[PDB]
Amino acid sequence: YFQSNALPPDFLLDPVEVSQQLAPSLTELVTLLDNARTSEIGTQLEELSVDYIVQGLLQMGWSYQPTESFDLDAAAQCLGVVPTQVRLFERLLQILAEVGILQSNQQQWQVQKTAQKVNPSKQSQSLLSQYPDEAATLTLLERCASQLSGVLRGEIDPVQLVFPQGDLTTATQLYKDSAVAKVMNTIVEKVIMKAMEKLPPSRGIRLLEIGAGTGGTTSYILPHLNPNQTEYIFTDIGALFTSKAQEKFQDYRFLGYQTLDIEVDPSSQGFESHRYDVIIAANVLHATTSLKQTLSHVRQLLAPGGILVLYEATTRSRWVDLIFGLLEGWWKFTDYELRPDYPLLNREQWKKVLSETGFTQVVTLPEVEGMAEALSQQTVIVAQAAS
C-alpha cells in the first residue's frame, strides 16, 4: 500500500473536482447570508465613507469653491498631504468624483458641489444601533477614518490605528467573523479538507499560510487538521503577528511559526522550494508590488501538484480604503499595466494572472445563482501548481 513520500502529492484532488463535490455545501452555505441586509449595510458604509473623507479634508483646510479647478499636486501641497500619502489622497479625490462632488477632467479636478456639513461619528453611532452585528466594522472605521487628516499629514502612523499593539482583535474580527468572511473562511476550510481527503495514511501533508496575520482564516482550518500527519507553517511578514498567533493557537502542536516576506525569494528566508502541498493566502497577495513576481514566489513554494487557496476582495470599497487603504501595502503596486489605480483584482483578472504564473485548473468560489451581491465582491480562488 505504501508508495514513496518523495514523489509528488498526486493524491490531491483537482480544484475543479473539489468545487464539484462541494457544490451542495456551497449552495446551502451561501443562503446563510442575508441578501437584502448585507447589501443595505454595505451601501450605507460607502455613504458614511464620504462623510469621513469630507470631514478630514475640511480639517486640513479644504477651501475649494465650486467651478475652481486644481491638480493633484497643488491640492496635496495646499492641504499638506505628505508625499507618501498622495496615492491614497488621489483615491479619496476619485471617491469624491464618484459621488458627484468633484469631476475629473484630464489630470485636473473641478469642484462641482460644495460638500455639506457632516458628522460621521453621529451617523456611525446610528448605524451601530441599527446593525450591532457590524460593531467591529463601524468601530474600526471610526478609529481609522476619524484620524484621516492626521494620516494624510504623516502625523499618525496608520498601523497604530489599524493594528495597535493593544487591539489586534478588532481588525481580526473583520477578517474572521464578519458576515461575508464567515462564508469565505468556511469555503477555505471545506476546500482544503476536501482536496486532501485521499491523503494516504502513510503520508504527511504540509500546509503553509502567507500573510496569516492574527490567524482569522487560520482558526477555521486548524480544528479539522489531523495532528498526526499535518505540518502547518504559520507565516507573516511581521513577528508581532506570529507572536500573537502563537499565543492563540497553543492547543495545536503541529503548528510552526516563521516570518516570510512573499515579495522576496522564499528560499532565501529558510523555506524549501516546491515542498508544500497547500499554500493559503487570505487577503495579502494584493498588498505587494508586482503580482506576477509575488505569484512566482508562491508557485516556487508549491509541490508539483500542490494547491493554492486564495482569499481576496475583488471590488473597490470606500470604507475599506479608509482602513486598510491607510496602510502602505494597499498602495505598493507598481504593475500599472495590470493594476492602474487599485491593488485588487476581479475574478477574471485573477484567473488570467494565475494562468500566466504557472497555475492551472483555476476555480473561483462561490458561484451560485441568486447569490448575495456581497459574496460577489470577495472570492476564494483555488488553483493547482502546473508543470
Ligand X SMILES: Nc1ncnc2c1ncn2[C@@H]1O[C@H](CSCC[C@H](N)C(=O)O)[C@@H](O)[C@H]1O
Among 9, 15, 213, 343, binds ligand X (CB under 6 A): 213
140 binds ligand X (CB under 6 A): no
The three grid cell numbers given for residue 187, joined into one nine-digit string: 469555503
Number of neighbouring beta carbons within 10 Å of residue 84: 11
By CB under 6 A, which span of 4-12, 19-27, 261-269, 367-375 interacts with ligand X?
261-269
Q: Grid cell 483555476 — which residue?
A: 362
217 is in an annotated binding site: yes
Pinpoint the alpha helices (H) of the chain: 15-21, 23-31, 35-59, 72-79, 86-98, 120-130, 135-145, 148-152, 159-162, 169-176, 179-195, 218-221, 239-248, 291-301, 318-321, 347-356, 373-376
Among 111, 208, 287, 302, binds ligand X (CB under 6 A): 287
157 binds ligand X (CB under 6 A): no
261 binds ligand X (CB under 6 A): yes
216 is in an annotated binding site: yes
279 is in an annotated binding site: no
242 is in an annotated binding site: no
237 binds ligand X (CB under 6 A): yes
288 binds ligand X (CB under 6 A): yes
262 is in an annotated binding site: yes
Instruction: Give the separation between CA 107 and CA 293, rounded to whole angstroms.
Output: 30
CB 184, min distance to ligand X, A: 10
By CB under 6 A, which span of 69-77, 117-125, 144-152, 211-219 interacts with ligand X?
211-219
Which amino acid is it at 238?
G
Beta carbon nearer to ligand X, 80 or 329: 329
Among 19, 178, 214, 357, binds ligand X (CB under 6 A): 214
Binding marks (x or -) toward ligand X, 161..200, rule CB under 6 A?
Answer: -----------x--xx------------------------
Identify the burial level of 210 via C-beta atoms within 10 angstroms of its C-beta, where 0-12 means exposed, 13-18 middle and 19 or more buried: buried
Beta carbon nearer to ligand X, 208 or 262: 262
68 is in an annotated binding site: no
Among 8, 80, 154, 329, binds ligand X (CB under 6 A): 329
Instruction: Give the separation between CA 249 and CA 122, rounded to whole angstroms.
Output: 38
Among 283, 357, 377, 384, binds ligand X (CB under 6 A): 283
Number of neighbouring beta carbons within 10 Å of residue 250: 9
CB 69, min distance to ligand X, A: 37
Between strands 205-210 and 108-111, the pairing is unpaired
Size of the site for ligand X (CB under 6 A): 25
Identify the burial level of 128 via C-beta atoms within 10 angstroms of its C-beta, where 0-12 means exposed, 13-18 middle and 19 or more buried: middle
Provide the 8-state DSSP code for 106: T
Contacts (CB under 6 A) with ligand X, residues 215-234: 215-217
CB 376, min distance to ligand X, A: 20
Which amino acid is it at 275?
R
111 binds ligand X (CB under 6 A): no
Instruction: Give the separation between CA 305 and CA 11, rounded to whole angstroms.
Output: 9
Q: 1, 4, 15, 6: which is closest to 278 by C-alpha?
A: 15
Check: CB of residue 382 under 8 Å from CB of residue 15.
yes
Please give the residue ranges that form the binding site for ligand X (CB under 6 A). 172, 175-176, 210-217, 236-238, 241, 260-263, 282-284, 287-288, 329
Binding-site residues from annotation for S-adenosyl-L-homocysteine: 172, 214-217, 236, 261-263
Binding-site residues from annotation: 172, 214-217, 236, 261-263
